[PDB]
Write a protein that binds this ligand. Structure first.
Ligand SMILES: NC(=O)c1ccc[n+]([C@@H]2O[C@H](COP(=O)([O-])OP(=O)(O)OC[C@H]3O[C@@H](n4cnc5c(N)ncnc54)[C@H](O)[C@@H]3O)[C@@H](O)[C@H]2O)c1
Ligand SMILES: NC(=O)c1ccc[n+]([C@@H]2O[C@H](COP(=O)([O-])OP(=O)(O)OC[C@H]3O[C@@H](n4cnc5c(N)ncnc54)[C@H](O)[C@@H]3O)[C@@H](O)[C@H]2O)c1
Ligand SMILES: NC(=O)c1ccc[n+]([C@@H]2O[C@H](COP(=O)([O-])OP(=O)(O)OC[C@H]3O[C@@H](n4cnc5c(N)ncnc54)[C@H](O)[C@@H]3O)[C@@H](O)[C@H]2O)c1
Ligand SMILES: NC(=O)c1ccc[n+]([C@@H]2O[C@H](COP(=O)([O-])OP(=O)(O)OC[C@H]3O[C@@H](n4cnc5c(N)ncnc54)[C@H](O)[C@@H]3O)[C@@H](O)[C@H]2O)c1
Ligand SMILES: C[As](C)(=O)[O-]
Ligand SMILES: C[As](C)(=O)[O-]
Ligand SMILES: C[As](C)(=O)[O-]
Ligand SMILES: C[As](C)(=O)[O-]
Ligand SMILES: [Zn+2]
Ligand SMILES: [Zn+2]
Ligand SMILES: [Zn+2]
Ligand SMILES: [Zn+2]
Lengths: 328, 328, 328, 328
């Protein structure tokens, strides 16, 4: 009944995921938990999620037990639960394009030789591989995706590298009978969706949005890495913010009579945990597809849990389709 | 082709309405204007809206031309258009419960004797009477509603006094074959709808809203009059704000792992003009119902343009039903 | 070496004071603590402050040990330290005008008969009586001030009732050789001083401040009680804020060329603790004056620690004069 | 009685300066104007400031009348006054290091051959040269400073290139009997001074400032150019902001009992005009020093009007010393 999970990139998101499973390890499956569609997704309780392997390139992570690696190097997300030794030692994966200038100047790459990822996946009997590679790691993400396909392991693509949403890659998974949920994991409530909802509000109520500004500040490596009319994008890295992300947004519009109507807000979130619940749902959905031997992109799951899914669908419809998929 | 309009309560809302018609008097009916469903609602262009009568109780308004009365006494909304003399002299209506302690201490009641409103409506051949009485004026609003019924004049109830939404009053209008659109005119984008949309966002995304605060400040008589877990309501009267209304709102919730997620915002609007467009649509809808000899609450119009309609309907559905009503 | 303290009004401020002494009971006198001029003020270490008596009128406080009374009824300030039983039982003081409509509707007055305060003070051998009566309690504050004079007990007036700053009362204390520090205890950083500093900034830099607004919200009885161009004052009571006080302030000015220059801010503080340190310094200053047999207002202490002192003096000068007073 | 002024760098600051003189051309010298120490500084009325020459490198400015050049290319500050043709044609200055990558990719350099600046200054009989070179233009600013010295023209250094504050350069001006006021012109109320005052407030009131963040956004070339614990610095370029600069700042501290005390604010200013008044005072001070034949840094003026003066002095003292200098 377990879901054997392997993690690529033991960063802040990996930390929120491992801690998250620990946090809700004893949750009642008849109750509702924030950030999770179901404490028990299909047959899988959160506790059924077992971490059996992990890959990284940082000297302070490779060779260390997963339980330590999640709190090492630049990892700095909020600690919600203690994580006992897992006995899972982080292995050396191929760096490829996963480490940009800012990262390289911040960490030291492990001296260990990159292992044979496909063999590593098979030896660990992994069911689902979750990829947390830094933004821009196209070669690296596609490399890991390929290993997953070759090892017959389901893939959950958490970063904005088009794989599940690239017909070419969708076909590779389909033909191999390997499931994939992916291309940019969603956050529960982040700046993007908040701005979308409000912009829609203006529009639906007849208020013309003339100008908009979105300033984002954070203090983690994901933010640092991304640093490397309408305005939007990472603004400034603020060390003491750690894994938190603050969004300062201003909407300026005109209502009846061209009368000015403004709205300014600040959204405060802990970035990584904002997606841990979503990932946990993705992981189990990918597991279910695998139990059924259905390869290719898991359509309902990707539409509801990812920002760049194979096929676009309204959230509620995507949600309903995902609920049907679960029941099977 | 004209819509003969009479105004009860020449305050800030009345000012935005009269100025609004002037502002869009030459608008192209194939274009879209903020705050208006249609420049030409059915057969009625904004310009077809003619002000033929008005009633008030303030010594600085009664006896004055409507064009002056809208800028008199405590009226202080934003001026978007010059208004030439209308030759419509503001008449003395019965005060009843339209003037509370705060208002009474602020203005001087007109020495003139209250006129016979029913006769006044008939003599002016009014088609639609729009009521802008202060909040709490139940006896006064029902009195004016009654006059409207007796004169065979359609009624648009802009304040939170239940008439269209009170089965008893709905029946009175129905039986008299007089249309009524009403009970609290909507604003395009105000604090209420903004908070609703965001609260829904949290809920839909699995974020538990634990605490919420909504502080409102303004500088007009409507605000002054209203001054006479969850928190909400008029907070403080700020003189120099005039007709503007600022809402400071904070939402505190918990996302996956009980991680704190907050959102704080400030909405800046010019309160009265925020409903002028809505009123203009209500007025013409009421006119159309009258042209058809259909009495009682105009269901589609009230559902879409009012906060407390006879029957609740999702905005988009109410909107679609209103579009069908227009075509007839 | 102890400073025998009695408290009038066991509310939020009393709670922050008692907890405060506990919190810094073991502080190093060569270190600096936020909110305190000296861990050891003259000969008195914070720990030398002993609570020996207290008076209230609330049924949930009178008859209870001080350690419980500080956390009873509507008290809701932040808890910074555990407070062990003190064996000091809260006595029934005369209500007089200390309980307004809002308070009366919130609490139940103790059935106990008001005691003879003068006798109570003498029996407890009190050195300093600190008054935390609600705003507006003039008769009550002057009554307690009188008892203090009669018992030869130094008085620290924390509320805005003019006593130390009223020549008539200043003379009563002087003639009795009883010290008094008083009339509205200062906060370290509150809305008032923050606005003062910024308004001064504008002025000194040649920016004309045209309009200003200050909105305050809180969730304690002090705030509730106070609820009973320029804008300023208590705006709205927000239950879940508890003892916290949030100030939303906006300054609008004109710089060179009449160019608009604005500044908007939000100050978040825990109201009661914001003055506990100040009170602790006041208490010891009053003790020192008593050791010297010097009656009347302690000038340096009042100028630096109170909002409405007998004599106004620039903070730094008042501070320097207070430092000289300490050395003696 | 005129002050012959030449401008190096016809950007936003140059625009605010030229418009500023026009705006207050008819000001009463017995009145006080925001941003100016005196409408009449010594013998010089604002109107005595005459623009007689200007230098730039942009193809859309060189060869154009100053009155047009101030509103050309990327200039986008607020327009406070119409500026009639001046008959002063912008000349081609040597680019040197005044145009970085971001600027070069934004504008096209003039095809004209750089002129002999020293000769140009002499031919125009310039009294004061104001330098508005972009940040980082060390070689260019020192080149222009040298020309000024050689032409016997007073220099006002508005950018952060150390000249007046570099003993070596201070001596060059002194030995040549040429005055210099300089190194980074002050703003009336900008983010820096606002943060300074508040940080000082915390400190003086016993509140320990633990963390601070300062985010700045703007929409002009100065901001774009600058883009090329504690946090501070240019955060993000927001096109539609134009010459406006918004500073989002948050201060987090601990008050008595280690209780959290926070302050968050947003300062909205029009960046360039925020220094026009200061420059006008600097220009006349430099003129007075020249009338007296006193070379080297004008100490009082630099201490009060510049961020990096030769010698540091408290603002009020520097202000008083400057007032004495004026009287002479
Ligand atoms: N945190 C969120 O809410 C959220 C939401 C959507 C998308 N994402 C994306 O998910 C990713 C995860 O971010 P974090 O989790 O915030 O990032 P992170 O920077 O903390 O960690 C990335 C990890 O990958 C490791 N890594 C780098 N190259 C590697 C390679 N070749 N092989 C194996 N490991 C390698 C790094 O050493 C590091 O431990 C980012 O791309 C982010 O943009 C995050
Ligand atoms: N402004 C908005 O966006 C908006 C939205 C929804 C509802 N409303 C409601 O609409 C009403 C109109 O507010 P304003 O228009 O903002 O208010 P207002 O205070 O400016 O004007 C009300 C007017 O009614 C007059 N009046 C009082 N008693 C009267 C009587 N017996 N007979 C005739 N006239 C009388 C007053 O003298 C005054 O001119 C308020 O009740 C308000 O709450 C306004
Ligand atoms: N908290 C601050 O930072 C601050 C700063 C300056 C001034 N003050 C003033 O100090 C006072 C203390 O406020 P809290 O401490 O915040 O107020 P509070 O409302 O929490 O407590 C006042 C207490 O006085 C008791 N009381 C009322 N009448 C009494 C009487 N006749 N005899 C004895 N006790 C009586 C009440 O039952 C209550 O326990 C207020 O007047 C407040 O405005 C507070
Ligand atoms: N605006 C303020 O409040 C303020 C306050 C302090 C300091 N400053 C500094 O003053 C300077 C002026 O900024 P703006 O005025 O905002 O900048 P800007 O970018 O608008 O204009 C600089 C001008 O210099 C011209 N220039 C560039 N290289 C040149 C060269 N070699 N010779 C002649 N002209 C050349 C450019 O083409 C442009 O017109 C900046 O360095 C800024 O940082 C501005
Ligand atoms: C069955 As359930 C509590 O996950 O919706
Ligand atoms: C016909 As139309 C421009 O009002 O939607
Ligand atoms: C002597 As001390 C540390 O209180 O200033
Ligand atoms: C003499 As004056 C009005 O500039 O201070
Ligand atoms: Zn992350
Ligand atoms: Zn209104
Ligand atoms: Zn208090
Ligand atoms: Zn500038």
């Amino acid at each position: 009944t377990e879901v054997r999970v392997a993690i690529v990139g033991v960063g802040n998101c990996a930390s929120s995921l491992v801690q998250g499973v620990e946090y809700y390890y004893n949750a009642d499956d008849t109750s509702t938990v924030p950030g999770l569609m179901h404490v028990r997704f299909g047959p899988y309780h959160v506790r059924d999620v077992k971490f059996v392997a992990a890959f990284d390139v940082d000297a302070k992570k490779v060779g260390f037990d997963l339980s330590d690696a999640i709190f090492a190097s630049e990892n700095n997300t909020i600690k919600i639960a203690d994580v006992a030794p897992t006995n899972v030692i982080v292995q050396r994966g191929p760096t490829l394009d996963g480490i940009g200038k800012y990262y390289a100047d911040t960490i030291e790459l492990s001296d260990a030789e990159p292992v044979d990822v496909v063999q590593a996946l098979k030896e660990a009997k992994v069911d689902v591989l979750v990829s947390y590679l830094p933004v821009g790691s196209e070669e690296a993400d596609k490399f890991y995706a390929q290993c997953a396909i070759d090892a017959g392991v389901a893939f959950v693509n958490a970063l904005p590298v088009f794989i599940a949403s690239d017909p070419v890659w969708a076909k590779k998974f389909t033909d191999a009978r390997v499931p994939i949920v992916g291309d940019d994991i969603k956050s529960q409530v982040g700046a993007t969706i908040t701005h979308r909802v409000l912009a829609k509000l203006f529009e639906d109520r007849g208020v013309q949005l003339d100008r908009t500004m979105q300033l984002n500040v954070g203090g983690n490596m994901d933010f640092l890495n991304m640093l490397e009319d309408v305005h939007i994008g990472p603004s400034d890295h603020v060390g003491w913010l750690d894994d938190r992300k603050w969004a300062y947004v201003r909407l300026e519009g005109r209502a009846f009579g061209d009368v000015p109507l403004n709205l300014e807000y600040k959204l405060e979130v802990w970035d990584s945990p904002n997606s841990a619940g979503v990932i946990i749902d993705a992981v189990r959905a990918a597991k279910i597809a695998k139990d059924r031997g259905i390869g290719g992109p898991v359509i309902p799951a990707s539409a509801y849990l990812m920002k760049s899914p194979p096929e676009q669908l309204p959230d509620d419809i995507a949600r309903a389709q995902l609920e049907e998929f679960i029941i099977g």
